[PDB]
Amino acid sequence: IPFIYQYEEKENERAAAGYGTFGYLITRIEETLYDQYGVFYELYASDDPNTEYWELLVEDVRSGSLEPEHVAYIFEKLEKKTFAYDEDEKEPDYTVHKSIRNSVYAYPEKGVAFARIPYFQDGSIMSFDCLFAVNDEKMRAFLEGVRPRLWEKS
Amino acid sequence: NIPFIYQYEEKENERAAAGYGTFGYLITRIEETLYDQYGVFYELYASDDPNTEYWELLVEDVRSGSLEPEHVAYIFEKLEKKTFAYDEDEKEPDYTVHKSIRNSVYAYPEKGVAFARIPYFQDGSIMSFDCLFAVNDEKMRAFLEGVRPRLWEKS
Amino acid sequence: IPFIYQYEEKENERAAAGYGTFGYLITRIEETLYDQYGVFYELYASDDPNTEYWELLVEDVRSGSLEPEHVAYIFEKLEKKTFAYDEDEKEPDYTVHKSIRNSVYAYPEKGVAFARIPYFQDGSIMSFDCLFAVNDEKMRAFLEGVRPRLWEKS
Amino acid sequence: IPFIYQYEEKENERAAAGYGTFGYLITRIEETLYDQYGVFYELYASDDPNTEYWELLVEDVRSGSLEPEHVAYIFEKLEKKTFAYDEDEKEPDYTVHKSIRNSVYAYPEKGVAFARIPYFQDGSIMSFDCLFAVNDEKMRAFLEGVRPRLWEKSK
Amino acid sequence: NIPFIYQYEEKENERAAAGYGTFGYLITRIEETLYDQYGVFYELYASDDPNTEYWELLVEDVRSGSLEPEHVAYIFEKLEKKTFAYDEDEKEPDYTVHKSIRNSVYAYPEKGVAFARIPYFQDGSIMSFDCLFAVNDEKMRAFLEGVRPRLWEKSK
Amino acid sequence: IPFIYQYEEKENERAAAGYGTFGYLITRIEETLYDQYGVFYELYASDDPNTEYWELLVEDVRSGSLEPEHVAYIFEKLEKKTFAYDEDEKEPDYTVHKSIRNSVYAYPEKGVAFARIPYFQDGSIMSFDCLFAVNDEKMRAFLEGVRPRLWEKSK
Amino acid sequence: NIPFIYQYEEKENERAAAGYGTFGYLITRIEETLYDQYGVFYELYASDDPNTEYWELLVEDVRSGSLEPEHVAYIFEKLEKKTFAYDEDEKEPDYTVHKSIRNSVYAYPEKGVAFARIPYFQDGSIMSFDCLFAVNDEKMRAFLEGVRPRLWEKS
Amino acid sequence: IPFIYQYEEKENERAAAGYGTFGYLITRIEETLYDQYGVFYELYASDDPNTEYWELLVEDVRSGSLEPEHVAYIFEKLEKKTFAYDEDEKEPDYTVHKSIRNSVYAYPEKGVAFARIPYFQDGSIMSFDCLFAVNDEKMRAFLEGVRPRLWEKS
Amino acid sequence: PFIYQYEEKENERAAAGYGTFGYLITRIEETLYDQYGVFYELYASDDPNTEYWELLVEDVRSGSLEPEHVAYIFEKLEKKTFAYDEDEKEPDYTVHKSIRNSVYAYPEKGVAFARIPYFQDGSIMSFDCLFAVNDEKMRAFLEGVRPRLWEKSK
Amino acid sequence: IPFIYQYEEKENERAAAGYGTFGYLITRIEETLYDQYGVFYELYASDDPNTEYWELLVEDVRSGSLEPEHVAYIFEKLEKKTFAYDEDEKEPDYTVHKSIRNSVYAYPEKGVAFARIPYFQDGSIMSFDCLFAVNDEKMRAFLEGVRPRLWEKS
Amino acid sequence: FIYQYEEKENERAAAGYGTFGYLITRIEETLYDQYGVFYELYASDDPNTEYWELLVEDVRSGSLEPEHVAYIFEKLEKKTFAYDEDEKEPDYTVHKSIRNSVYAYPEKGVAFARIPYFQDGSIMSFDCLFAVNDEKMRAFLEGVRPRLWEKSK
Amino acid sequence: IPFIYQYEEKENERAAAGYGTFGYLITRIEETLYDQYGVFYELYASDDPNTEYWELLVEDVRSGSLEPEHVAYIFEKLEKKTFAYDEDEKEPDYTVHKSIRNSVYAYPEKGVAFARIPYFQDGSIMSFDCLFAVNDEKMRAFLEGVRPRLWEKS
């Protein structure tokens, strides 16, 4: 019945750790997706653990494919463009494309969107891999369509 | 009278427990919300649950549209609200889309138990506390006793 | 002769980190023990690495023994009760008892008190194992009794 | 559907952690190059994992080349010169050149700029390798020239 | 005349060195208090002593009730003021309950040496700066000379 | 074309972590070296990975040589003296000298100043190995003289 | 016709695989022993079973004196013929002496299956193969189906 | 001019380690494939570190596909059939299939043969992954056809 | 048919280590019969349990007449030993009979112990074997371990 | 002064282990190159730890280059062909080329020969990297042209 | 019983015990012939280090205390040195080899032998300890720690 | 009092494994050194854990220094020459010299000989670093001069 801890918290201490940044960014990404397309997008994965559709996004931006449509940049002074030169790679590639990290990339055809949101920690720049969809059935179309898109490339 | 080197009297602002502000806010609000929906008082039985089996079963039931799981509420407004089962690691393919487990307050009402995967940002990466709630101890004991046969049912 | 560093101390910046939380809890534990048991309890192990008599406490709370007495809860909105179910157990235990973490237990006859103080750091919630006692010889009697109690119960 | 969390995000609490310094530094780098070269460079790499063209940069500055031009120093009281003494190296090179870390170097004809931004983390001093460029074709030519320049260096 | 990217002149509050404020407040008062007990000015000779032998011998002496290690003070009030030496893993335990090594200032007044295992909190757990004090260099060396003589004398 | 994050960052957010102490300390170490030696000194390594000439310093202070000279102590209440005992070594060294950490040591003839700045990561007492010099040829002459000095120590 | 460096030609002994002789002798003799006891042909299906569930079912059945499993024979003469279930770690001290699992062949003649945990010497400590047998796969499929219902009643 | 070690050794210690076992098995598999299909086969991969086309053979024999054909069993007293029950997967997969290990399987029209040869070492029984083919032309098509079926199956 | 068609000679049928193990176990059983008149049999071949093995070394160290020293396994290996553990602050100078390379027996309890030395790796390790007259003598002995552990503790 | 070990090591026991096989293969390889190139080749690396000139060889055979010439196969029943497929690699390659393992290759103008001698250890199949050269100048010339060759493909 | 192969007497041989038995028998035989008393094994691979260090230092300091009895292997090292590159203060004393040698403290009734063996090629050493009677062994172990204290002074 | 082990070893069974080849190599190296320098060399380090003077041997051989003199080669078909190429080192040496491994060298004035005997174990070529000398005083002088040489070269 008695409680050792009787400290009265200030309301600011009830704030979550970092949810303000994530919230403002998610709100503005959804808002801008609507600004361009007029649709109500929604978050579906916070730190996406799946790589196949993300490597597919990378390939589609590199090849200058039609519908992988850059929407906006997350942070202004982080990288706006990037290259694909890996010194380890046996045969180098020199494609200079727009940045995957720090950019919002929407497939409006498949009603889906992707985000690679930077954040600073441990003396390095790290990436939140977020996934967006205006409605469930379109997301369900994209996830179904991932393996077909691979089969054509294969 | 033996003396003390550290003669500074620490302040009340400096007695604040690290992390308990947000955790207490969220647990109290989950308690209040569960009371508003199911007119009963739930209380914490686990803070971060090392066990996974019944947690797995909650996910499996929400995936298979099972009746007993019920989605009480969402924890964070701008965080995830749905999720998918697609695991590229697994050879077997499933593409089912359901509501989220993380950021979701759930309740088995007949069984008298409640589940929550409270998200939190630590070192950037998103992690979750698996919190388990119950009304009375007999309800929780019945749930734990029935969890292990449900595995037989699935298998 | 001279010194390179020449910055004053407001003494606001002279305060130790973590002692404020530890001091409030330790003092309120000692106070709460006085209100219930009118005698003075003192810290003897801040983070007791000895797991044997802590194991014995948990089994006594499982068994329903009246020897351990639940004096108070440490945090209001942390676990007030727990269970002994673990997947890995070949023979499962379903006993639901009061929590060990977030609780203070005092053996009144032996003059010894246990406090498993929760703390949120990094990955999860973790627990300080603090051990209190009224006088030195009661502590000695408890420790010598530990190992007999260990092999009597088995 | 209501939400469990209801706290009000403040405008000071909406800030990103550590971006204000990285952005400030990057902005001041881009402002410095324009005040000296009349053209707009942009960030094409933040923390650069690639090493080969960075080692060609340090080789150029060590070798008294005029190809990289020192533009500015990032921090005033950090290292402003350096040397190349490794005890494990059997034959020591004692060359004293200008700093690579804490310095911004530029290849004006190639259109590519280099920056090694220092920072303090868990004690030790580390560095972000930043890479700048006027335009994409400037970058593609630089990347295409890295391995050829290495072939000449080995010849 | 080379430009500088970083142009931010800091207020005085943020040139502060983290941790030195607590350490300095502690060291000053340890030296101050060690004057009132033994009337001698004291000085730091090891800030985080990495050697273990003579610190281990301090525990044996306090465990034995030896008259020479004398308890100057406790560092933090609400931390441990006593401790014990039971080891579950040790095949034959020792149940001695003495005064806490951590959180205490102990001084060998004749040898002109003082020991301080200062507590501090890092990553949750409680950790201890082992700080070594002395009055002058010749006494310190004399004590340092005495470690191995004092070490195997006890074995007898 | 547009930007998602649009916080009007306040000027305080432009500060860099750890620089305030480094800038103040490096500036004052420089000021001190001019006052007692009449020459301007500058940083050549902020955290020196090298160990050989740093080890030579401690033997010069341990042997009371003219070669080093104790300019000042960096922190008031940290070690102003130290000792060289190591339990693991069979043959002991009981020499008590002055502190390497918390001290500024200058070779006034060679124009090279050493500083081992202590810092608290809160976790422990760690040290930055800074190296100062007046000019590049004085530095080059020191780096070359290290190994002949080491060969003389061998005899 | 191109050359080959290895013109050496193998003794017929070197054709022999390492370890198969002992494993084959045992499998042959275990089969023959199952053939003489139950008059039917029993054959191998698992050579080192990675599945623990139906093997720990076997242990408890033997421990509980259950009539369901029968003990066909012993692998080795001077190895263990009996055993106990005492685990110092367990707070529940079990003092039951039953026939050994290792060095023993067990069989459920009802279900048309046979169990053999064959002991082998390697690197000092004794280790064991867990080999599974069955008359025909039609019999085995029912047993594999039957594992989960039996594991259920214990739950 | 001189040499320290002057020991003369004839053909008897010129033996390589383990090749005698590998040679006898490889020679007989090739010969047995010749008697069944009339076409000389040859080894192209010894211990195939790749996994995905070997999963195909696993699924084919289990799924009762007539793509594989059982050429022979390698060892007489090792397993001739196996099963797929595993604790991790909630799916029981009680399917009783012919053994992948200890069996030589060949896709005769595709000209590619498989063999998971077994060996006893480290106590545990382990398996080589030898891959046989007749001509380099068919082999190239097989590798290029392996990536389709992974995307086709899903 | 079967790829492998080499017929084993009988020498290849043998098992590594069992020949020595069987010889030693047989002769231990023979030696115990010809001293105590009762047939002993193996109940554990490499006992992982340690509680009653520790009690045996102390009974031998205490000069206790409870355990009876029956035989030595290897002629020229150790026949005496000491417990000097430099790690401990208390050096023990007690010279007791060797646990390793010896066969002990509790005739009343009907249980025997053997620490059989084997030369493998570099160092010398040991098999710890348990023997017993019958099942009930074993069960009674096994249950007496926890009582005797309580006495030595107090 | 005496000697404890009075056993004169027996003649059969004096030979070393592995040199008989290694000596056979090197002697046969050297002889093989003498007929094929009319010059004496000699060993310069017995277990070559270097990777750069070995990774260039496999690319040379892969590319169909005319510089490297196949001399002989080491073991008859091991691989005589292989493929460069790595399912891990994002850049797929399905080339079927001659085997580097089990083969002796030579750069006859450059005066350097390579041999990847296969051996069986602890189950898996492994390789000895052996390098031959006609004279030191040839070796110094090959070594000085390795790194320029590496930057040529990029 | 499943396994019915009857092992030959040669098959019953225990690996390693032949060499260990030969070496132990010869060491004890030499000890008897030189000092007239029967020595016997008290440690076969002594995990302890202190008194072994005492032997090494007694030979390094050329004390007349330990007597060199024998060399175990003819072609292995008969001499050795104490240079350790990692030790800052280097001792260049060249003493006789501890490994490959049998040394005895004849009054103290104790013998030491560091027998070399080759495993994975690399040469390692079995430390073996011998004594005439248990009481002499007790006395030696008793004096071990005071010997360290004396070296400390 | 009894002994369980009742098998009497034969003389072949007494063999210390490895001492035969090691003894042949040491005896032959000693004899060759006697024949070349008319003096008697003797082993002073069996498996030298020290690296400094061996690195100095490598330096002197690389620079053709007159002080080390090649005495013999250990194995006939092993490498007689070697190179000093390391990809890991940014600036590389291409020098081709006589092999340190498989060779016996000797500093004839210092009275100290070096040998690096190769051996084949578990699929790897490894090296016993053996040190030889005529008298202890010359060995002492060499060890004393080690560090001087070390910073003489630098």
JSON list of N, CA and C in Angstrom, two decimals, chain D residues 44-81:
[
{"chain": "D", "resi": 44, "resn": "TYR", "atom": "N", "xyz": [27.49, 15.50, -51.39]},
{"chain": "D", "resi": 44, "resn": "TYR", "atom": "CA", "xyz": [27.22, 14.23, -52.06]},
{"chain": "D", "resi": 44, "resn": "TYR", "atom": "C", "xyz": [27.57, 13.03, -51.20]},
{"chain": "D", "resi": 45, "resn": "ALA", "atom": "N", "xyz": [28.26, 13.23, -50.08]},
{"chain": "D", "resi": 45, "resn": "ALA", "atom": "CA", "xyz": [28.54, 12.17, -49.12]},
{"chain": "D", "resi": 45, "resn": "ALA", "atom": "C", "xyz": [28.61, 12.80, -47.74]},
{"chain": "D", "resi": 46, "resn": "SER", "atom": "N", "xyz": [28.04, 12.11, -46.75]},
{"chain": "D", "resi": 46, "resn": "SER", "atom": "CA", "xyz": [27.99, 12.63, -45.39]},
{"chain": "D", "resi": 46, "resn": "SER", "atom": "C", "xyz": [29.14, 12.05, -44.57]},
{"chain": "D", "resi": 47, "resn": "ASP", "atom": "N", "xyz": [29.04, 10.78, -44.19]},
{"chain": "D", "resi": 47, "resn": "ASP", "atom": "CA", "xyz": [30.16, 10.01, -43.68]},
{"chain": "D", "resi": 47, "resn": "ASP", "atom": "C", "xyz": [30.57, 9.04, -44.78]},
{"chain": "D", "resi": 48, "resn": "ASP", "atom": "N", "xyz": [31.69, 9.32, -45.42]},
{"chain": "D", "resi": 48, "resn": "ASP", "atom": "CA", "xyz": [32.08, 8.58, -46.61]},
{"chain": "D", "resi": 48, "resn": "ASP", "atom": "C", "xyz": [32.76, 7.27, -46.22]},
{"chain": "D", "resi": 49, "resn": "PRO", "atom": "N", "xyz": [32.18, 6.11, -46.55]},
{"chain": "D", "resi": 49, "resn": "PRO", "atom": "CA", "xyz": [32.88, 4.85, -46.28]},
{"chain": "D", "resi": 49, "resn": "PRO", "atom": "C", "xyz": [34.03, 4.59, -47.23]},
{"chain": "D", "resi": 50, "resn": "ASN", "atom": "N", "xyz": [34.06, 5.23, -48.39]},
{"chain": "D", "resi": 50, "resn": "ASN", "atom": "CA", "xyz": [35.10, 4.98, -49.37]},
{"chain": "D", "resi": 50, "resn": "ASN", "atom": "C", "xyz": [36.42, 5.59, -48.92]},
{"chain": "D", "resi": 51, "resn": "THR", "atom": "N", "xyz": [37.52, 4.89, -49.22]},
{"chain": "D", "resi": 51, "resn": "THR", "atom": "CA", "xyz": [38.85, 5.26, -48.76]},
{"chain": "D", "resi": 51, "resn": "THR", "atom": "C", "xyz": [39.81, 5.63, -49.87]},
{"chain": "D", "resi": 52, "resn": "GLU", "atom": "N", "xyz": [39.64, 5.08, -51.08]},
{"chain": "D", "resi": 52, "resn": "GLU", "atom": "CA", "xyz": [40.68, 5.19, -52.10]},
{"chain": "D", "resi": 52, "resn": "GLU", "atom": "C", "xyz": [40.91, 6.64, -52.53]},
{"chain": "D", "resi": 53, "resn": "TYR", "atom": "N", "xyz": [39.84, 7.38, -52.83]},
{"chain": "D", "resi": 53, "resn": "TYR", "atom": "CA", "xyz": [40.05, 8.76, -53.25]},
{"chain": "D", "resi": 53, "resn": "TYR", "atom": "C", "xyz": [40.35, 9.67, -52.07]},
{"chain": "D", "resi": 54, "resn": "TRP", "atom": "N", "xyz": [40.07, 9.24, -50.84]},
{"chain": "D", "resi": 54, "resn": "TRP", "atom": "CA", "xyz": [40.52, 10.00, -49.68]},
{"chain": "D", "resi": 54, "resn": "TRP", "atom": "C", "xyz": [42.02, 9.85, -49.47]},
{"chain": "D", "resi": 55, "resn": "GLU", "atom": "N", "xyz": [42.55, 8.64, -49.69]},
{"chain": "D", "resi": 55, "resn": "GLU", "atom": "CA", "xyz": [43.99, 8.44, -49.57]},
{"chain": "D", "resi": 55, "resn": "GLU", "atom": "C", "xyz": [44.74, 9.14, -50.69]},
{"chain": "D", "resi": 56, "resn": "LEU", "atom": "N", "xyz": [44.14, 9.23, -51.88]},
{"chain": "D", "resi": 56, "resn": "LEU", "atom": "CA", "xyz": [44.75, 10.03, -52.94]},
{"chain": "D", "resi": 56, "resn": "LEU", "atom": "C", "xyz": [44.78, 11.50, -52.57]},
{"chain": "D", "resi": 57, "resn": "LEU", "atom": "N", "xyz": [43.80, 11.97, -51.80]},
{"chain": "D", "resi": 57, "resn": "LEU", "atom": "CA", "xyz": [43.82, 13.35, -51.33]},
{"chain": "D", "resi": 57, "resn": "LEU", "atom": "C", "xyz": [44.97, 13.60, -50.37]},
{"chain": "D", "resi": 58, "resn": "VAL", "atom": "N", "xyz": [45.15, 12.71, -49.39]},
{"chain": "D", "resi": 58, "resn": "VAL", "atom": "CA", "xyz": [46.22, 12.89, -48.42]},
{"chain": "D", "resi": 58, "resn": "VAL", "atom": "C", "xyz": [47.58, 12.72, -49.10]},
{"chain": "D", "resi": 59, "resn": "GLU", "atom": "N", "xyz": [47.67, 11.82, -50.08]},
{"chain": "D", "resi": 59, "resn": "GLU", "atom": "CA", "xyz": [48.91, 11.69, -50.84]},
{"chain": "D", "resi": 59, "resn": "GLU", "atom": "C", "xyz": [49.23, 12.99, -51.57]},
{"chain": "D", "resi": 60, "resn": "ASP", "atom": "N", "xyz": [48.22, 13.63, -52.16]},
{"chain": "D", "resi": 60, "resn": "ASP", "atom": "CA", "xyz": [48.45, 14.87, -52.89]},
{"chain": "D", "resi": 60, "resn": "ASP", "atom": "C", "xyz": [48.94, 15.98, -51.97]},
{"chain": "D", "resi": 61, "resn": "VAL", "atom": "N", "xyz": [48.31, 16.12, -50.80]},
{"chain": "D", "resi": 61, "resn": "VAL", "atom": "CA", "xyz": [48.70, 17.17, -49.87]},
{"chain": "D", "resi": 61, "resn": "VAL", "atom": "C", "xyz": [50.07, 16.87, -49.26]},
{"chain": "D", "resi": 62, "resn": "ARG", "atom": "N", "xyz": [50.34, 15.59, -48.95]},
{"chain": "D", "resi": 62, "resn": "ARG", "atom": "CA", "xyz": [51.66, 15.22, -48.45]},
{"chain": "D", "resi": 62, "resn": "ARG", "atom": "C", "xyz": [52.74, 15.47, -49.49]},
{"chain": "D", "resi": 63, "resn": "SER", "atom": "N", "xyz": [52.45, 15.19, -50.76]},
{"chain": "D", "resi": 63, "resn": "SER", "atom": "CA", "xyz": [53.43, 15.27, -51.83]},
{"chain": "D", "resi": 63, "resn": "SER", "atom": "C", "xyz": [53.64, 16.69, -52.35]},
{"chain": "D", "resi": 64, "resn": "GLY", "atom": "N", "xyz": [53.20, 17.71, -51.62]},
{"chain": "D", "resi": 64, "resn": "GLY", "atom": "CA", "xyz": [53.38, 19.07, -52.08]},
{"chain": "D", "resi": 64, "resn": "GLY", "atom": "C", "xyz": [52.67, 19.41, -53.38]},
{"chain": "D", "resi": 65, "resn": "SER", "atom": "N", "xyz": [51.66, 18.64, -53.76]},
{"chain": "D", "resi": 65, "resn": "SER", "atom": "CA", "xyz": [50.88, 18.96, -54.95]},
{"chain": "D", "resi": 65, "resn": "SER", "atom": "C", "xyz": [50.07, 20.23, -54.74]},
{"chain": "D", "resi": 66, "resn": "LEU", "atom": "N", "xyz": [49.85, 20.96, -55.83]},
{"chain": "D", "resi": 66, "resn": "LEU", "atom": "CA", "xyz": [48.94, 22.10, -55.82]},
{"chain": "D", "resi": 66, "resn": "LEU", "atom": "C", "xyz": [47.53, 21.71, -56.26]},
{"chain": "D", "resi": 67, "resn": "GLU", "atom": "N", "xyz": [47.30, 20.43, -56.55]},
{"chain": "D", "resi": 67, "resn": "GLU", "atom": "CA", "xyz": [45.99, 20.00, -57.02]},
{"chain": "D", "resi": 67, "resn": "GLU", "atom": "C", "xyz": [44.91, 20.19, -55.96]},
{"chain": "D", "resi": 68, "resn": "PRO", "atom": "N", "xyz": [45.06, 19.72, -54.72]},
{"chain": "D", "resi": 68, "resn": "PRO", "atom": "CA", "xyz": [44.11, 20.12, -53.68]},
{"chain": "D", "resi": 68, "resn": "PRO", "atom": "C", "xyz": [44.50, 21.48, -53.10]},
{"chain": "D", "resi": 69, "resn": "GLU", "atom": "N", "xyz": [43.52, 22.36, -52.99]},
{"chain": "D", "resi": 69, "resn": "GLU", "atom": "CA", "xyz": [43.73, 23.69, -52.43]},
{"chain": "D", "resi": 69, "resn": "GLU", "atom": "C", "xyz": [43.04, 23.77, -51.08]},
{"chain": "D", "resi": 70, "resn": "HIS", "atom": "N", "xyz": [43.82, 24.04, -50.04]},
{"chain": "D", "resi": 70, "resn": "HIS", "atom": "CA", "xyz": [43.26, 24.24, -48.71]},
{"chain": "D", "resi": 70, "resn": "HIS", "atom": "C", "xyz": [42.36, 25.47, -48.71]},
{"chain": "D", "resi": 71, "resn": "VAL", "atom": "N", "xyz": [41.09, 25.28, -48.37]},
{"chain": "D", "resi": 71, "resn": "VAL", "atom": "CA", "xyz": [40.10, 26.35, -48.41]},
{"chain": "D", "resi": 71, "resn": "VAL", "atom": "C", "xyz": [39.96, 27.03, -47.06]},
{"chain": "D", "resi": 72, "resn": "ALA", "atom": "N", "xyz": [39.81, 26.25, -45.99]},
{"chain": "D", "resi": 72, "resn": "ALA", "atom": "CA", "xyz": [39.57, 26.81, -44.67]},
{"chain": "D", "resi": 72, "resn": "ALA", "atom": "C", "xyz": [39.84, 25.73, -43.63]},
{"chain": "D", "resi": 73, "resn": "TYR", "atom": "N", "xyz": [39.88, 26.15, -42.37]},
{"chain": "D", "resi": 73, "resn": "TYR", "atom": "CA", "xyz": [39.98, 25.26, -41.23]},
{"chain": "D", "resi": 73, "resn": "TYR", "atom": "C", "xyz": [38.61, 25.20, -40.55]},
{"chain": "D", "resi": 74, "resn": "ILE", "atom": "N", "xyz": [38.17, 24.00, -40.19]},
{"chain": "D", "resi": 74, "resn": "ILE", "atom": "CA", "xyz": [36.83, 23.86, -39.64]},
{"chain": "D", "resi": 74, "resn": "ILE", "atom": "C", "xyz": [36.76, 24.42, -38.23]},
{"chain": "D", "resi": 75, "resn": "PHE", "atom": "N", "xyz": [37.61, 23.93, -37.33]},
{"chain": "D", "resi": 75, "resn": "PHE", "atom": "CA", "xyz": [37.64, 24.41, -35.96]},
{"chain": "D", "resi": 75, "resn": "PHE", "atom": "C", "xyz": [38.95, 25.16, -35.71]},
{"chain": "D", "resi": 76, "resn": "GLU", "atom": "N", "xyz": [38.87, 26.19, -34.87]},
{"chain": "D", "resi": 76, "resn": "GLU", "atom": "CA", "xyz": [40.00, 27.11, -34.74]},
{"chain": "D", "resi": 76, "resn": "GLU", "atom": "C", "xyz": [41.12, 26.53, -33.88]},
{"chain": "D", "resi": 77, "resn": "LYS", "atom": "N", "xyz": [40.78, 25.85, -32.79]},
{"chain": "D", "resi": 77, "resn": "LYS", "atom": "CA", "xyz": [41.77, 25.36, -31.84]},
{"chain": "D", "resi": 77, "resn": "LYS", "atom": "C", "xyz": [42.04, 23.87, -31.95]},
{"chain": "D", "resi": 78, "resn": "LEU", "atom": "N", "xyz": [41.55, 23.21, -33.00]},
{"chain": "D", "resi": 78, "resn": "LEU", "atom": "CA", "xyz": [41.94, 21.84, -33.28]},
{"chain": "D", "resi": 78, "resn": "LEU", "atom": "C", "xyz": [43.21, 21.84, -34.13]},
{"chain": "D", "resi": 79, "resn": "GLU", "atom": "N", "xyz": [43.68, 20.64, -34.48]},
{"chain": "D", "resi": 79, "resn": "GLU", "atom": "CA", "xyz": [44.92, 20.50, -35.24]},
{"chain": "D", "resi": 79, "resn": "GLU", "atom": "C", "xyz": [44.86, 21.33, -36.52]},
{"chain": "D", "resi": 80, "resn": "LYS", "atom": "N", "xyz": [45.89, 22.14, -36.74]},
{"chain": "D", "resi": 80, "resn": "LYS", "atom": "CA", "xyz": [46.01, 22.93, -37.95]},
{"chain": "D", "resi": 80, "resn": "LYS", "atom": "C", "xyz": [47.17, 22.47, -38.81]},
{"chain": "D", "resi": 81, "resn": "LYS", "atom": "N", "xyz": [47.98, 21.54, -38.32]},
{"chain": "D", "resi": 81, "resn": "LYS", "atom": "CA", "xyz": [48.99, 20.85, -39.11]},
{"chain": "D", "resi": 81, "resn": "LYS", "atom": "C", "xyz": [49.13, 19.44, -38.55]}
]
